[PDB]
Design a protein around this ligand. Sequence first.
Ligand SMILES: *[C@@H]1O[C@H](CO)[C@@H](O[C@@H]2O[C@H](CO)[C@@H](O)[C@H](O)[C@H]2NC(C)=O)[C@H](O)[C@H]1NC(C)=O
Ligand SMILES: *[C@@H]1O[C@H](CO)[C@@H](O[C@@H]2O[C@H](CO)[C@@H](O)[C@H](O)[C@H]2NC(C)=O)[C@H](O)[C@H]1NC(C)=O
Length: 333
Amino acid sequence: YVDVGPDSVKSACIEVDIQQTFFDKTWPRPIDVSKADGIIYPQGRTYSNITITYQGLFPYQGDHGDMYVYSAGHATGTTPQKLFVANYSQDVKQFANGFVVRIGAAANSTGTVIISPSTSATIRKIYPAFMLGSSVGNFSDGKMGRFFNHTLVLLPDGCGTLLRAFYCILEPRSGNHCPAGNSYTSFATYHTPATDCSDGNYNRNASLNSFKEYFNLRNCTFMYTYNITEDEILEWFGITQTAQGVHLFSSRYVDLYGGNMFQFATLPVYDTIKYYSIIPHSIRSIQSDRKAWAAFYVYKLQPLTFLLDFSVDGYIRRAIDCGFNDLSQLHCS
Ligand SMILES: *[C@@H]1O[C@H](CO)[C@@H](O[C@@H]2O[C@H](CO)[C@@H](O)[C@H](O)[C@H]2NC(C)=O)[C@H](O)[C@H]1NC(C)=O
Ligand SMILES: *[C@@H]1O[C@H](CO)[C@@H](O[C@@H]2O[C@H](CO)[C@@H](O)[C@H](O)[C@H]2NC(C)=O)[C@H](O)[C@H]1NC(C)=O
């Protein structure tokens, strides 16, 4: 097994305030395949200046997906206090064929800081975190969201400059507010921008450390890191699984400005992923440092036949979901 660094030496966890009503917003960003939203590129052949019909894993036209939002935590003028999160940890979803994720879409626009609805701020991109596995159930106090045996965790870190992917048994810790302790509400991750995101010295383990407060990582078969360049550009992330393992997709490395997703990793996870949840993150800012963080959107994948329009340079800038209606069907034919 892999050394993933020391266990947390903390005797308690940070208290977590779950307030789902603050995260219930209607900010629709439905799939528009005309603009090639949510498209994993059919890698393997050379396509250029051509229109084809292709059956693969796609989200459906007009799917609103599931929206998730991360918020600044409670704070006084000087001191971060309780984390502030939605009820995401108890909402375990079926993995099925996997999913794609629209990330950072609202970046640059003006939006509410969530925990203080009357306060607006410029929206910044934030990366999603996921917990995935083969077996789920409840924690000791009865709350849902516990993943058993080896669990895949995808956790961004370093103020959005890396992604960590690791596959470990998650042993719930027993201090106050921890998942095997008293006064448990939800687990979460956090970082503390004042100390973790100072210029030139980003803390590349902040979120991982926060996670290690709620769970001891045991028998990790791997822990990989992927560096990310800092920007506010819209991006797409995807995840699927085959007998070869778990496949991660991103628009970042191959189509940063266009959004087409290409595979960047295959993780040696051969036990079938059946379940996932979104890991809530809360940003331990002080009141005067509060920002708004871009909602992200998760859309389930399914086998569908699309018309794909490949440009001269090889990218897909237009698609049709053939089964959407008879008109689309006709156009595909
Ligand atoms: C920060 O996280 C990294 C993982 O990204 C930890 O890296 C491990 O560090 C130990 C030494 O402490 C090495 O023996 C392992 O080989 C490292 N693992 C990997 C996957 O790189 C690191 O320990 C963490 N740092 C702190 C201070 O906790
Ligand atoms: C937010 O604004 C930034 C800055 O203008 C945008 O970043 C640019 O994105 C375009 C592609 O859309 C690139 O060609 C530029 O090189 C980027 N500039 C920098 C300085 O990174 C960003 O796209 C905007 N985000 C959203 C969601 O609109």
